[PDB]
Write an enzyme that holds these catalytic residues in place. Structure first.
Site, PDB file in Angstrom:
ATOM      1  N   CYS A  75       0.796  -1.221   0.000  1.00 17.28           N
ATOM      2  CA  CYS A  75       0.000   0.000   0.000  1.00 17.28           C
ATOM      3  C   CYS A  75       0.832   1.276   0.000  1.00 17.28           C
ATOM      4  O   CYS A  75       0.272   2.353  -0.239  1.00 17.28           O
ATOM      5  CB  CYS A  75      -0.946   0.000   1.202  1.00 17.28           C
ATOM      6  N   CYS A 157      -1.834   3.417   1.358  1.00 21.78           N
ATOM      7  CA  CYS A 157      -1.425   3.820   2.700  1.00 21.78           C
ATOM      8  C   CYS A 157      -0.155   4.658   2.628  1.00 21.78           C
ATOM      9  O   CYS A 157       0.455   4.817   1.567  1.00 21.78           O
ATOM     10  CB  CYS A 157      -1.196   2.610   3.617  1.00 21.78           C
TER      11      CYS A 157
END
Length: 242
Positions: A75, A157
């Site tokens: 991510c 992320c």
């Protein structure tokens, strides 16, 4: 019978063949998805839109395909983009540890293709498919790309990058998948920073595009969503560092 004719081009010819071949090649060069039964994912793909009126497709129609094509990508190395797919895919090709949506299985499967079905039959429509502004905005391709882009943004992320074309009238366009879906699905619980890469272009007219009003608008959007914003001008596109 009562065939529906649309103002847009039909399904890409050899669409099942192309999808299956792409799935094969992807599972080959991406061993993290070798567990994929390509015939099953093609069945899910076709069941998403076959025997359904092309203007009433919803995200749930694509949900089975979304499960067979689940892909947990790292991510912290996701590269979003908008209106510069050439340079973005060049970057992910020379720096092979970062991923665009088209570097995932489903994005690689459907990239640059067109498809739709018919309401009364179970055959793929190769004659025409809906135009987005003249026929209907929610069709198999639209619903698919919205769904997959939402799930790809929701999985990002840490620091998320987005590549932007500085030569566009609207460097950041609200009427794009990045502006209309992706920016609004970055998770503040996982993402701390969105970093824009404003690629420069235009033989002359190369100033600070991180001060452009659309970039400030994107900044305020991402800020109101409680995520930090980062912007870096890129004057010449040297992937030859990479």
């Amino acid at each position: 019978r009562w065939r529906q004719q649309w103002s847009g081009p039909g399904t890409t010819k050899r669409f099942p063949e192309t999808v299956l071949a792409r799935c094969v090649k992807y599972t080959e060069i991406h061993p993290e998805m070798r567990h994929v039964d390509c015939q099953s994912v093609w069945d899910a793909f076709k069941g998403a839109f076959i025997s359904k009126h092309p203007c009433d497709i919803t995200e749930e129609d694509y949900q089975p395909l979304m499960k067979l094509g689940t892909q947990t990508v790292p991510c912290n190395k996701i590269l979003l983009w908008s209106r510069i797919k050439d340079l973005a895919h060049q970057f992910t090709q020379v720096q092979r540890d970062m991923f665009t949506l088209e570097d995932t299985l489903l994005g690689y499967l459907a990239d640059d293709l067109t498809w739709c079905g018919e309401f009364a039959t179970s055959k793929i429509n190769y004659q025409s498919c809906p135009d987005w502004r003249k026929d209907c905005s929610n069709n198999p391709v639209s619903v698919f790309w919205k769904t997959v882009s939402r799930r790809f943004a929701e999985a990002a992320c840490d620091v998320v990058h987005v590549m932007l074309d500085g030569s566009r009238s609207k460097i950041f366009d609200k009427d794009s998948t990045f502006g209309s879906v992706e920016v609004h699905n970055l998770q503040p619980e996982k993402v701390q920073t969105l970093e824009a890469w404003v690629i420069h272009g235009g033989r002359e007219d190369s100033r600070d595009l991180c001060q452009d009003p659309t970039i400030k608008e994107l900044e305020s959007i991402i800020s109101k969503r409680n995520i930090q914003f980062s912007c870096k001008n890129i004057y010449r596109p040297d992937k030859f560092l990479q």
